[PDB]
Amino acid sequence: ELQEKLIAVNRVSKTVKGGRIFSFTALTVVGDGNGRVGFGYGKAREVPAAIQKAMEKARRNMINVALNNGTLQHPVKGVHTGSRVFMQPASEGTGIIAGGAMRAVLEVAGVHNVLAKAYGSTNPINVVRATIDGLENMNSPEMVAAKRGKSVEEI
Amino acid sequence: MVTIRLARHGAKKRPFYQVVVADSRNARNGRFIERVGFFNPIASEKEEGTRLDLDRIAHWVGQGATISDRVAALIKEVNKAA
Amino acid sequence: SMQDPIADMLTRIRNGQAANKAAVTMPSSKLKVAIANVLKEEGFIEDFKVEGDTKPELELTLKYFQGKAVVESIQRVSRPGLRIYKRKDELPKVMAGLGIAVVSTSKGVMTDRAARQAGLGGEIICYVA
Amino acid sequence: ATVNQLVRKPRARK
Amino acid sequence: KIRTLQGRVVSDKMEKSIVVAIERFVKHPIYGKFIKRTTKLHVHDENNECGIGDVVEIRECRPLSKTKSWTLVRVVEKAV
Amino acid sequence: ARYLGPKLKLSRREGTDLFLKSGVRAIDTKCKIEQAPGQHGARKPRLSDYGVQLREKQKVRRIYGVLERQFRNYYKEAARLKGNTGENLLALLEGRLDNVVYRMGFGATRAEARQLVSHKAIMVNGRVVNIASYQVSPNDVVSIREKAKKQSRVKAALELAEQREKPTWLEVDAGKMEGTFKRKPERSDLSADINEHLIVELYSK
RNA sequence: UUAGCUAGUAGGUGGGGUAACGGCUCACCUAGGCGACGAUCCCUAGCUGGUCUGAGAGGAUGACCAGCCACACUGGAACU
RNA sequence: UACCCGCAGAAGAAGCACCGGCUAACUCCGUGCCAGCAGCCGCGGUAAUACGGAGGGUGCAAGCGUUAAUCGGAAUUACUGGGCGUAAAGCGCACGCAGGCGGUUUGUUAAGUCAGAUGUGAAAUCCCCGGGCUCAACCUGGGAACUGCAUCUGAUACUGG
Ligand SMILES: [Mg+2]
Ligand SMILES: [Mg+2]
Ligand SMILES: [Mg+2]
Ligand SMILES: [Mg+2]
Ligand SMILES: [Mg+2]
Ligand SMILES: [Mg+2]
Ligand SMILES: [Mg+2]
Ligand SMILES: [Mg+2]
Ligand SMILES: [Mg+2]
Ligand SMILES: [Mg+2]
Ligand SMILES: [Mg+2]
Ligand SMILES: [Mg+2]
Ligand SMILES: [Mg+2]
Ligand SMILES: [Mg+2]
Ligand SMILES: [Mg+2]
Ligand SMILES: [Mg+2]
Ligand SMILES: [Mg+2]
Ligand SMILES: [Mg+2]
Ligand SMILES: [Mg+2]
Ligand SMILES: [Mg+2]
């Protein structure tokens, strides 16, 4: 039922008395295609052991977000270390246009029609952190109507 | 002088004429004044392809605009067909 | 100094909303009343009171959801260093129509949604997001 | 960064 | 009804002529800042009644010299 | 301006039935359908994110026989037309003149249906159009000319497509040897498994 | 890493001049004029409708089409 | 001349580039940091899918590659939309003209701005709906657009006087 996708694998190392000992870092995301994305992270000696530990953390750390028929409510800014994220919902039938890092996040939520562009650093681990945090502060017309208090055309 | 003539546009081996008012010192596709109409010599002659406006014609003929013999053929048949 | 007191007004709102303050006070003016009265009519704040005549002091009651910031962010657009003006069809929207844009015209201070029925343009004050 | 600075001299294109 | 400018006088040394400066607010085509732009015109002054710094009203006329194309209407405020 | 290689070899590279033959003989009785052409066909290849845009594009272009210079021009028209890009993409693919002859059943294969358009046999509203890339307008009627009715390529093809299912928007007449293109088809009326969004994203960069 | 430039120059009178206003020209009178909102000097360049690129804002450019200006071995002059 | 009738028989009509990653596609042999390859990363001294060749494949197509040039990618002169404690960058500091900017209340002006209208923004190009050349390119009808400038009539919250 869950839709998973590997993003990137980067071999890192640790220096010891005998020399260098390598390891693997893998970034994964999962999702249901209905506005729930959970990202994970793993550290293991072997590559199928590395992607599994990222999948094991991916069951939890999974959030909710208000979709509008498969696209965003409004354009919202995303900021992180060096990843300036600017997304914008598009009209029907445009398709997913984004980088390879953002495409794994947007497909597992069921998002179809969004503009996307990343400014600054091109590190794929820093782009997705602003992308998840850019959706949880993105708000809905219903929850701002719980703030404003009127059942008029803005809903 | 102020004259009424044609301007050959269209691609090669497809003649088409623009009905404008221009000066005799200008070229065929040169500096005109205003567009009056159009002419299609390779028209099927069952549909559109010839349309002018006698209101803008009589405004300049009364001011002394000369008319070419090819353009005046359209004038002599716009009253026969309408 | 205090050359843009509207920017000073937006500074005092954004601080107390984020720092869980219950109510704030500020020096009043004619323009600060005409902006806060619109925000009272648009569900962003609660109430405003005036105090003093030789020293006009404006007060604002804050607003929360469960202790969460109702006004998440607000952006001063025009400024004394660079004036911003738009026409009746070039009025920008905030969050694709969710947030409101405070535009002062000759028919008083209103929103971009209220300026459609008014059909005017003028100075953008702030993006109430 | 200041707009009034760029009134005197614009951004120098290399 | 006719085309009419207003400004102030910056020079009045020459006879039968004055120099009127015109300021205008211009939106910059790249940045948008309203900038004062000085337009210095040469205006015919009949009887030499205009002094320095006088707010004055001028209108358009034919060229009377190599540089002059503007003439006098009336003085709004003189010698304040 | 065509492809003169083997037909089912393209399906050995893709792994999907592309209606390249009639349907009398089965798809698995001629070649191993899940083997790539060459030395390492039984070895499973890796498929990156760049592949699923490219392998989906090669699947559609080998059906209609449309080269890259003309298929990019189809994307230029689908972008300029309003509505969905993928729905406007299918209107240009299905509105091709060689596809209308094929889906009615006058030709057994798409290669045979292109030759019937090319070698002076198809009338469009009583007029012969000898190019396979004509955009077919709605409410038109197509037919076979009087000299091409006696050819055996029409007699052998009216029974094979009769065994298969017919499209909704077409009206096949076999006795008069004619047809009717009524309306424009939709997304659900065509093949649902073809993802048109995979091709648009490749031309979106 | 161009800050002062300019004496027919700036303005006025009268005469002359051109199809038309005018230092356009001449005598006289005044000492102004221009300029840090780039005068002046040096170098480069026909310009524009546009084209190309770009989500847009911008960026580059001015072949074919069209509009205007300039030029016709070099320089100068007038007639018709 | 386009076009059309009639004739004969698949007969007269497919190549180039790439194949380590970027970036679509893998084996084998020869060679031995030599020869070469290469846009980047960097490949080859005894097992090189990277050199040379073969087999096989991929991307295109009467075209295919390369070089040169411009913009995009490049938010890498950042108005939109960048920075200046240590990555490049806050003058050693102060005074101050011009320039920029300015508390608060009322009146006035209507300058800036905004609303409306007129005239204009040549045609062509681009866009919208069409038509036509068997199709397409192309040609072409009307409309939109040309976000411009000028003038007049209005409104006065803000900015200016
Ligand atoms: Mg973590
Ligand atoms: Mg960077
Ligand atoms: Mg020729
Ligand atoms: Mg004189
Ligand atoms: Mg030159
Ligand atoms: Mg020319
Ligand atoms: Mg690969
Ligand atoms: Mg080679
Ligand atoms: Mg070896
Ligand atoms: Mg070709
Ligand atoms: Mg180069
Ligand atoms: Mg840039
Ligand atoms: Mg930077
Ligand atoms: Mg440093
Ligand atoms: Mg210091
Ligand atoms: Mg035009
Ligand atoms: Mg037109
Ligand atoms: Mg046109
Ligand atoms: Mg057609
Ligand atoms: Mg005031």
Side-chain angles (χ1 to χ4, degrees):
Chain A
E1 194 271 331
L2 58 91
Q3 183 179 2
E4 67 184 3
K5 186 177 289 294
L6 180 61
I7 299 169
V9 175
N10 294 114
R11 183 181 68 189
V12 298
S13 66
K14 186 177 185 293
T15 304
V16 295
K17 293 181 181 179
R20 293 179 180 90
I21 295 171
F22 293 99
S23 65
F24 292 99
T25 62
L27 183 63
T28 64
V29 292
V30 300
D32 55 355
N34 199 359
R36 291 180 66 189
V37 179
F39 66 98
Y41 184 76
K43 288 176 68 67
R45 306 291 183 183
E46 192 68 28
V47 178
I51 54 96
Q52 184 178 2
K53 291 181 181 180
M55 290 296 174
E56 288 176 353
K57 304 296 186 292
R59 279 89 173 94
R60 64 180 178 88
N61 208 166
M62 193 172 181
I63 47 96
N64 291 319
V65 66
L67 266 293
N68 193 1
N69 297 113
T71 191
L72 299 178
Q73 305 298 327
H74 64 275
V76 64
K77 276 79 176 174
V79 66
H80 204 264
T81 300
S83 297
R84 281 88 58 85
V85 175
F86 180 74
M87 294 182 286
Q88 182 177 1
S91 178
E92 183 179 1
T94 61
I96 299 167
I97 46 101
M102 291 181 181
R103 186 176 292 172
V105 180
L106 294 170
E107 186 176 0
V108 302
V111 179
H112 292 90
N113 293 316
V114 279
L115 297 173
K117 179 67 174 66
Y119 296 102
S121 178
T122 62
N123 194 0
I125 192 167
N126 287 316
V127 174
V128 296
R129 292 175 63 89
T131 306
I132 300 299
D133 294 332
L135 294 176
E136 64 181 2
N137 56 6
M138 185 184 76
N139 53 6
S140 178
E142 289 84 4
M143 64 178 70
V144 301
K147 294 180 181 179
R148 188 176 293 172
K150 58 190 285 185
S151 68
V152 197
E153 197 269 331
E154 56 89 16
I155 293 174
Chain B
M1 74 292 291
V2 176
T3 187
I4 300 168
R5 63 184 179 180
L6 294 175
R8 185 183 185 274
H9 290 88
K12 187 175 73 68
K13 263 63 188 299
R14 184 69 63 190
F16 191 76
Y17 291 101
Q18 291 292 107
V19 179
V20 294
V21 176
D23 195 359
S24 64
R25 280 88 59 85
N26 296 115
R28 183 178 66 189
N29 293 319
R31 183 176 178 179
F32 67 97
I33 297 170
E34 65 181 2
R35 182 182 181 271
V36 176
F38 65 98
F39 177 71
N40 193 0
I42 320 294
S44 64
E45 292 178 353
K46 67 181 181 180
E47 287 179 352
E48 192 179 2
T50 299
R51 182 179 295 113
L52 278 76
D53 193 0
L54 294 173
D55 291 331
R56 298 299 299 161
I57 293 169
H59 185 272
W60 290 97
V61 173
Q63 292 179 356
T66 61
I67 299 169
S68 296
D69 290 331
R70 183 67 179 270
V71 181
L74 296 175
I75 301 168
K76 290 175 71 175
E77 71 181 3
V78 72
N79 291 319
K80 291 174 71 175
Chain C
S1 67
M2 58 286 292
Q3 296 179 358
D4 195 359
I6 305 300
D8 198 1
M9 180 180 71
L10 297 178
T11 304
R12 302 175 76 93
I13 295 167
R14 195 183 300 114
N15 290 318
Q17 184 63 255
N20 292 317
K21 301 285 103 175
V24 296
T25 56
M26 61 182 69
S28 179
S29 68
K30 187 176 180 181
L31 188 61
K32 290 182 181 180
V33 174
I35 297 169
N37 199 1
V38 178
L39 294 174
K40 185 178 179 181
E41 293 179 353
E42 293 291 327
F44 291 101
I45 58 170
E46 288 290 327
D47 195 0
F48 65 98
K49 295 184 290 294
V50 293
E51 290 86 4
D53 55 354
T54 183
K55 288 182 261 73
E57 186 70 26
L58 193 147
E59 191 271 331
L60 292 176
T61 303
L62 271 298
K63 188 174 182 177
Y64 297 97
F65 188 70
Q66 286 84 241
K68 192 184 287 184
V70 174
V71 179
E72 183 180 0
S73 66
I74 194 161
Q75 296 294 321
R76 178 66 178 170
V77 177
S78 179
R79 63 186 181 92
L82 183 62
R83 298 293 184 185
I84 303 300
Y85 296 103
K86 293 292 184 182
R87 288 191 293 272
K88 69 180 290 296
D89 55 355
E90 295 179 353
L91 291 176
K93 294 181 176 67
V94 179
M95 293 182 181
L98 292 175
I100 59 170
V102 176
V103 175
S104 178
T105 60
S106 295
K107 297 284 103 176
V109 175
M110 65 184 74
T111 63
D112 54 355
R113 184 177 292 173
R116 296 291 186 270
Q117 293 179 356
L120 293 175
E123 182 178 1
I124 300 168
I125 294 172
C126 62
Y127 287 165
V128 182
Chain D
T2 302
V3 176
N4 207 165
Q5 289 178 355
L6 293 176
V7 177
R8 286 91 168 94
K9 181 63 66 68
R11 298 287 174 86
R13 180 66 179 172
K14 65 178 73 175
Chain E
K1 182 173 71 69
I2 61 170
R3 184 79 275 278
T4 300
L5 290 173
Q6 292 85 16
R8 64 182 295 274
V9 178
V10 299
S11 178
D12 54 355
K13 297 297 290 182
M14 64 184 73
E15 293 179 353
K16 292 182 180 179
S17 297
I18 55 171
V19 178
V20 175
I22 305 300
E23 292 180 353
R24 66 192 181 99
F25 289 98
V26 178
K27 184 178 178 181
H28 192 271
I30 299 171
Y31 301 104
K33 186 176 176 67
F34 291 158
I35 302 168
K36 293 181 181 180
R37 294 289 90 190
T38 300
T39 299
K40 293 181 181 179
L41 294 173
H42 293 171
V43 175
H44 178 72
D45 192 3
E46 184 67 29
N47 293 319
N48 292 319
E49 66 182 2
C50 296
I52 186 168
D54 293 335
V55 176
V56 74
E57 184 177 2
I58 61 170
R59 68 181 176 88
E60 188 178 1
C61 65
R62 69 180 182 178
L64 274 75
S65 70
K66 187 177 181 180
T67 61
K68 290 169 65 175
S69 297
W70 298 90
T71 186
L72 187 66
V73 177
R74 64 180 177 88
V75 177
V76 176
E77 185 176 3
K78 55 178 73 175
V80 68
Chain F
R2 292 179 66 250
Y3 182 74
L4 277 75
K7 271 76 176 176
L8 293 177
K9 186 178 179 179
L10 298 175
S11 296
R12 293 177 68 186
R13 177 62 66 194
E14 293 292 328
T16 303
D17 183 74
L18 299 176
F19 291 100
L20 295 173
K21 286 184 179 292
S22 66
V24 177
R25 190 176 294 275
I27 187 167
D28 54 356
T29 60
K30 293 178 72 68
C31 64
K32 293 181 183 179
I33 199 65
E34 292 180 354
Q35 183 181 3
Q39 186 177 3
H40 296 284
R43 188 261 188 190
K44 183 256 182 66
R46 61 179 61 87
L47 183 61
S48 66
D49 200 3
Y50 183 76
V52 299
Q53 294 178 357
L54 184 61
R55 302 295 294 166
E56 185 69 27
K57 183 177 73 69
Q58 294 297 110
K59 182 174 73 175
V60 180
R61 288 176 64 248
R62 291 172 185 176
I63 295 169
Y64 299 100
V66 175
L67 293 174
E68 186 69 28
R69 183 65 63 86
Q70 187 175 2
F71 186 77
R72 186 178 294 274
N73 291 319
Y74 289 163
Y75 182 75
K76 291 180 182 178
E77 183 68 28
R80 188 179 65 85
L81 291 174
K82 297 181 289 294
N84 191 1
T85 302
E87 291 180 353
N88 289 318
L89 183 63
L90 294 175
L92 294 174
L93 292 174
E94 190 69 27
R96 289 178 59 87
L97 186 60
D98 56 355
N99 197 7
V100 176
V101 178
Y102 178 72
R103 297 291 178 89
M104 289 179 181
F106 288 159
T109 65
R110 294 182 184 272
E112 185 178 1
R114 186 174 179 177
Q115 189 178 3
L116 294 174
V117 175
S118 178
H119 291 172
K120 291 181 183 292
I122 303 298
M123 286 184 179
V124 177
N125 292 319
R127 298 293 183 184
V128 176
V129 176
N130 55 5
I131 54 97
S133 66
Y134 180 72
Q135 182 64 42
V136 177
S137 296
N139 290 318
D140 290 331
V141 287
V142 297
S143 66
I144 308 299
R145 69 180 294 165
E146 297 293 328
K147 295 182 184 293
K149 291 180 182 179
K150 292 182 180 180
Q151 294 181 357
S152 68
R153 292 183 293 173
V154 181
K155 185 67 69 177
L158 290 174
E159 294 292 327
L160 299 177
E162 187 178 2
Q163 297 176 357
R164 293 182 291 113
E165 66 270 14
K166 296 183 290 294
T168 301
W169 62 92
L170 296 176
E171 296 293 327
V172 179
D173 194 0
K176 293 181 181 180
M177 293 180 183
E178 66 182 2
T180 301
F181 183 77
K182 184 177 89 275
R183 65 176 177 86
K184 301 296 291 295
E186 295 292 327
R187 175 66 181 87
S188 66
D189 291 332
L190 292 175
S191 180
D193 56 356
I194 297 171
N195 290 318
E196 292 85 6
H197 62 88
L198 295 174
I199 304 169
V200 178
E201 293 173 354
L202 185 63
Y203 289 102
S204 297
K205 64 179 73 175

